[PDB]
Amino acid sequence: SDGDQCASSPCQNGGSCKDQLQSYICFCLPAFEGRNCETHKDDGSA
């Protein structure tokens, strides 16, 4: 481990938190956005 990234589950939008060395990876729906899933992108456009 390298730093407290996935300690208190920073992933939001009910996403899964996985430690990927140093940083982390949140598993959120394809309609969310943001490093910690703090945005809901539902426009599409292009």
UniProtKB/Swiss-Prot annotation:
The modification (3R)-3-hydroxyaspartate is found at residue 19. This is Factor VII light chain. Changing residue 35 to Q: In FA7D; Charlotte. Transmembrane segments: none annotated. Disulfide bonds join 6-17, 11-26, 28-37. The chain holds residues 105 to 147 of 466 of the full protein. It comes from the Eukaryota. Glycans are attached at residues 8, 16. The lineage of its organism: Eukaryota, Metazoa, Chordata, Craniata, Vertebrata. The gene is F7. Changing residue 9 to A: No effect on O-glycosylation by POGLUT1. Drastic decrease in O-xylosylation. Residues 2-38 form the EGF-like domain. The record marks 9 as: Important for S-112 for O-xylosylation.
